[PDB]
């Protein structure tokens, strides 16, 4: 009665994730000057290029060359030996900016999902949490000089064996771990593989989940000197399952980064997480999936759905009534409840938007019923 | 004991979908000359621009100006009055091409899901099937001159009320429909709304699913003259839930368009659909979710998982054994079974990759057990 489940994450220097962080660096820059900025900033990265495209309504005057280049510096691409350099890369701006509310209409149509699971303290699947932490660990050891051969582009994948308990899920052991990470010309493969096991995996994954049968795919393709935008074109919103629940729960298709609160792709997904987490932390269920949907120009959600996997004594209809009584999921109210005009978005753009840093949507609401 | 569920689709002229079709037009062009072409083509669209970026290993010499512009012509953007024109738009190429197997390694790490449901004949959720068909209907009426005021950019959203039957799902009625579609300067709103109800919705949605309480959001934002890449920047792989199951089942994060068979994002997702559909059409279950995962450089999947929603008399472990005995999910075998070197991909890039046209992955395998 066991099953395998797999989730992945990627590091800050992965080209898709570079674009997410830049898109959010742009959004933060606008919001610092104009809290009411409307932003739909897409970023594209390739060998020697960052291109920005999209539509903005804002009173801000933003230095795109300075914002983009500082974001690439933070990530760690600061020399041509690493395949990309903030000092000398091309930055092209194709943004179209115009000068310029409880019941504001949704900025678009779409559907969004929230999810929570009691298998971890942060109410997230173990598979995705470990995957994220492996990439975070790599960045730490790169930045503090423990493994100076490390470069910013990385990918991890974690397969966990579960058992199920009346619709809830219980992690037993890690079955397989993959790690691929960009590196300098000097470091040999055996040194890298040894370090990824001892200094990364064993520092991150609780020892009770590792055993002698755990499968390790470390630098499985061999060498990986060419990385970042040089090796692989990147686009904003191409890591949406990394950003959310790692294959668990569900997704409505919408990207997060480069978008203001009126874009319910972001705001309503954050709120649905908040609802899902509030239901689990309030003891109403162990595992829960929440769907919402919107029409452009209309404030109230078109639909709200709760799925509890059989982990509640209450019916799904009862949980829906509790949600309706405790949450107002119009964009103009979510913005107040979750403080979404604050320029906090660049910090969400790597290592997942959920299960860390106690952002407002991770602080559960106390429920009246 | 009922619940709402919502799914969306978009038309061919939606900017994200323009990019998917162009990316696949590029892939098809390479495969026509070189069946073994390796392609990772990303497309970006904005006011007056199409940009191609990515990595190619191929012997083909492809006329990118001709391929891109013909794809935009097919879509219907052929005049500046429509906001975009294949004859006069900018085409920028940043592709990096190099000159150049049963047990070929996966081209990347990742996870992929397949899904099938017996609620429709095509084994797809009704919500997403109707959403797609509404957009297809709009394109038909535009192209045959019934509604000459229609332009190529459109979006639809369908909310259906379901009941559940031992883990299977049964559609009762359509609860809400949204349609937003780009139009000329002359047509008035009442004429558009009347036509969208009578000539689009009533032609597409079976009358047994429509009643007097069905909610209609037709041109809900008002007017919508500015559309396509002018109104909204587009990128390849930003409609991945539209491309697959509309919120149902699950997704691994990977985009389809612009990718050859070695990119398991595409090939293994197509195969997992094939597995899921084969299990339902073979009578082993009514509804089923299949996960697979891979490591870059490794041929065999790292994990395979089956979830039947309680709709089988067999255990999930038993269904997994049947899958293993009947399917080889290495990329180098899927390529033969599903004929993935054939240049058929541009036709997959709108209206979903599943539930139509009897592509090889929609023809179920007869299962030995
Ligand atoms: K790519
Ligand atoms: K956009
Ligand atoms: Mg990518
Ligand atoms: Mg988009």
What are φ and ψ of residue A138, in 5° steps?
-60, -45
- The answer to whether the CB of B199 falls within 8 A of the CB of B220 is no
* φ/ψ (deg, to 5) at B299: -80, -50
CA of B35, closest CA in chain A: separation in Å?
22
Question: Is B55 a known ligand-binding residue?
Answer: yes
* Residues present in chain B in total: 369
What whole-number distance in Å separates Cα of residue B302 and Cα of residue A4?
Answer: 10
d(CA A310, CA B232): 41
**Tokens found for residue B154:** 């459109």
B223 marked among binding-site residues: yes
Burial class (CB in 10 A: 0-12, 13-18, 19+), B31: buried
Separation in Å, CA B43 to CA A234, A270, B70, B75, B151: 11, 29, 15, 15, 21
Half-sphere exposure of A111 (CA within 13 A, CB side): 35
Q: Which of A5, A19, A46, A253 to mutate to test the interface with B (most CBs of B within 10 A)?
A: A253
Distance CA B83, CA B297 (A): 44
Q: What are phi and psi of A366, to 5 degrees?
A: -75, 125
CA-based torsion, B117, B120, B126, B132: positive or negative? positive
Structural tokens at position A226: 């060419």
Query: Cα–Cα distances in Å, from A328 out to A58, A335, B143, B148?
Result: 27, 11, 42, 41
Can you point out the beta strands (E) in chain A?
A: 2-10, 38-46, 49-57, 78-79, 84-85, 90-98, 110-117, 150-165, 168-183, 215-218, 234-235, 287-294, 303-307
Q: Is A93 on the interface with B (CB under 8 A)?
A: no
Q: How far is the CA of A236 from the centre of ligand 2 (A)?
A: 10
Q: Which residues contact A119 (CB under 8 A, 6 or more apart)?
A: A125, A126, A168, A169, A170, A171
Q: Least CA distance to B54: which residue of chain A?
A: A233
- Which residue segments constitute the domains of chain A, with CATH numbers given? 1-9+126-226 (3.30.300.10), 10-104+227-263 (3.30.300.10), 105-125+264-368 (3.30.300.10)
Q: Which backbone phi and psi does B363 adopt, to 5 degrees?
A: -95, 110
Residue B173, phi then psi, degrees to nearest 5: -155, 155
Phi, psi (degrees; rounded to nearest 5) at B64:
-65, -35
Contacts of A6 (CB under 8 A, 6+ apart): A127, A157, A158, A159, A160, A176, A247, B111, B291, B293, B302, B303
Residue in this structure with the two tokens 């771990």, named with its chain if needed:
A177
Q: How many CB pairs under 8 A join A and B?
A: 207
DSSP, collapsed to helix, strand or coil, labels residue B178 as strand
Query: Residue B54 and residue A46: Cβ atoms within 8 Å?
Result: yes
* Cα(B235)–Cα(A354) distance, integer angstroms: 25
User: Taking the alpha carbons of B319, B322, B328, B334 in that order, is the dihedral positive or negative?
Assistant: negative
Q: Which chain A positions have a beta carbon within 8 Å of B252's beta carbon? A: 8, 241, 247
CB contacts, 8 Å: B175 with chain A: 303
Q: Please, which residues have CB less than 5 A from ligand 2, an ion?
A: A 40; B 232-233
- Which string of DSSP letters, residue by residue, matches A206-232? -GGG--TT-EEEESTTS---S-HHHHS
List beta partners, residue B92: B51
DSSP conformational letter for B200: I
Task: Give the side-chain half-sphere CA count within 13 A for A298.
Answer: 19
SS3 label, residue A347: helix
A157 touches chain B (CB under 8 A): yes
- Selection from A236, A240, A227 nearest residue A76 by Cα: A227
B356 Cβ contact list (under 8 Å, min separation 6): B122, B132, B362
Helices and strands, counts by H and E, chain A: 9, 13
DSSP labels for B90-116? EEEEEEEEE---TTPPBSS-EEEEEEE
Write the burial class of residue A92 (CB in 10 Å: 0-12 exposed, 13-18 middle, 19+ buried).
middle
Contact (CB, 8 A) for A13 and A73 = no
Is A212 labelled a binding residue? no
- For residue A101 the two structure tokens come to 């509310």
Give CA–CA dist A114/A276, Å, rounded.
Answer: 6
Residue A342 tokens, joined: 């604050």
Q: State both tokens at A335.
A: 């913005």
Q: Are A157 and B109 an interchain contact pair (Cβ–Cβ within 8 Å)? A: yes
CB atoms within 10 A of CB B320: 17
Q: How far is CA A96 from CA A39, B267, B284, B300, in A?
A: 10, 37, 54, 47
Please check if A140 is assigned to a binding site. no
CA of B255 to the centre of ligand 3 (A): 8
Exposed, middle or buried by CB within 10 Å (0-12, 13-18, 19+), for B275? Answer: buried
Residues B116 and A298: their CA atoms lie apart, in Å, by: 32
- Kindly report the number of other CB atoms within 10 A of residue A333's CB atom: 18
Residue B241 near residue B95, CB atoms below 8 Å: no
* Catalytic positions of A: 14, 16-17, 42, 55, 155, 224, 232-233, 238-239, 259, 263, 265
Give contacts of B51 with chain A, Cβ < 8 Å: 44, 51
Q: What are phi and psi of A105, to 5 degrees?
A: -70, 150
Q: Is A213 annotated as a binding residue?
A: no
Alpha helices in A211-292 (DSSP H): 228-231, 264-281
Is B196 near chain A, with CB under 8 Å?
no
* Chain A touched by B158 (CB under 8 Å): no
Contact status, residue B160 vs residue B4, Cβ threshold 8 Å: yes
Beta bridge partners of A156: A9, A179
Ligand 3 midpoint to CA B93 (Å): 18
Per-residue CA distances from B23 to A235, A237, B33, B36, B148 (Å): 14, 17, 16, 17, 28
Q: How far is the CA of B236 from the centre of ligand 1 (A)?
A: 10
Say whether A242 and B236 touch across the interface (CB within 8 A).
no
Within B2-149, strands assigned E span 2-10, 38-46, 49-57, 78-79, 84-85, 90-98, 110-117
Q: How many beta carbons lie within 10 A of that of residue B136, not counting itself?
A: 21
Structure tokens at B157: 């959203």
Q: How many Å apart are CA B230 and CA B46, to the nearest integer?
A: 6
Contacts of B255 in chain A (CB under 8 A): 238
Q: Could you count the other beta carbons within 10 Å of the beta carbon of residue B254?
A: 22
* The two structure tokens encoding residue A41: 């900033």
Q: Which of A45, A178, A218 to mutate to test the interface with B (most CBs of B within 10 A)?
A: A178
Contact B175 A303 (CB under 8 A): yes
* Diameter of chain B measured on Cα atoms: 63
Provide the shortest C-alpha distance from residue B337 to chain A (in Å): 25
Hey, what are A158's tokens? 């974690």
- What size, in residues, is chain A? 369
Tokens for B7?
């799914």
Q: What is the resolution of this structure in A?
A: 2.3
Query: What is d(CA A23, CA A260) in angstroms, rounded to the nearest whole number?
Result: 11
Distance CA B79, CA B65 (A): 17
What phi, psi does A169 have (nearest 5°)? -120, 145
Q: What is the distance in angstroms between the Cα of A51 and the nearest Cα belonging to chain B?
A: 10
Query: How far does residue A256's CA lie from ligand 2's centre (Å)?
Result: 11
Mutate to test the interface with A, among B115, B235, B292 (most CBs of A within 10 A): B235
Angstrom distance (rounded) from CA A170 to CA A117: 10
Question: How far, in whole angstroms, is CA A111 from its chain's centroid?
Answer: 18
DSSP state of B222: S
Place of tokens 């994954």: A205
Among the listed residues B199, B192, B155, B194, the one whose alpha carbon sits nearest the alpha carbon of residue B177:
B155
**Contact, B7 vs B249, CB < 8 A?**
no
């Amino acid at each position: 009665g066991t099953f395998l489940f797999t989730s992945e994450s990627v590091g800050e220097g992965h080209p898709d994730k570079i674009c997410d962080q830049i898109s959010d660096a742009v959004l933060d820059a606008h919001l610092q000057q104009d809290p009411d900025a409307k932003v739909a900033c897409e970023t594209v990265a390739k060998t020697g290029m960052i291109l920005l495209a999209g539509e903005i309504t804002s009173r801000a005057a933003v230095d795109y060359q300075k914002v983009v280049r500082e974001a690439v510096k933070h990530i760690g691409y600061d020399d041509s030996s690493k395949g990309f350099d903030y000092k000398t890369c091309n930055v092209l701006v194709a943004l179209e900016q115009q000068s310029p509310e409880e019941d504001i209409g949704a900025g678009d149509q779409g559907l969004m999902f929230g999810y929570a699971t009691d298998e971890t303290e942060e109410c997230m699947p173990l598979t995705i949490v470990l995957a994220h932490k492996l990439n975070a660990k790599l960045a730490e050891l790169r930045r503090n000089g423990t493994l100076p051969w490390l470069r910013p582009d990385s990918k991890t994948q974690v397969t966990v064996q579960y058992m199920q308990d009346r619709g809830a899920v219980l992690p037993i052991r890690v079955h397989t771990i993959v790690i691929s990470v960009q590196h300098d010309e000097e470091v040999c493969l055996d040194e890298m593989r040894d370090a990824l096991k001892e200094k990364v995996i064993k520092a991150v994954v609780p020892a009770k989940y590792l055993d002698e049968d755990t499968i390790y795919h470390l630098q499985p393709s061999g060498r990986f000197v060419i990385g970042g935008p040089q090796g692989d074109a990147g686009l904003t919103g191409r890591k949406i399952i990394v950003d959310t629940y790692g294959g668990w729960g569900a997704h409505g298709g919408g990207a997060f980064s480069g978008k203001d609160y009126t874009k319910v792709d972001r705001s309503a997904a954050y709120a649905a997480r908040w609802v899902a987490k509030s239901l689990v932390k309030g003891g109403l269920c162990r595992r829960v999936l929440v769907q919402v949907s919107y029409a452009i120009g209309v404030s109230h959600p078109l639909s709200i759905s709760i799925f509890h996997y059989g982990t509640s004594q209450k019916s799904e209809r009862e949980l829906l009534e509790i949600v309706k009584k405790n949450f107002d999921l119009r964009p103009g109210v979510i913005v107040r409840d979750l403080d979404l005009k604050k320029p906090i978005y660049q910090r969400t753009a790597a290592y997942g938007h959920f299960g860390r840093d106690s952002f407002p949507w991770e602080v559960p609401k106390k429920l009246k019923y």
